[PDB]
Amino acid sequence: VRRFAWWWAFLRR
Incomplete structure (x- = not known):
């Protein structure tokens, strides 16, 4: 999950 x-x-807010 570098970027x-x-x-x-x-997005996963």
Whole structure:
């Protein structure tokens, strides 16, 4: 989750 860190989380809000 290198990049997902700054957004994959963003989506799983």
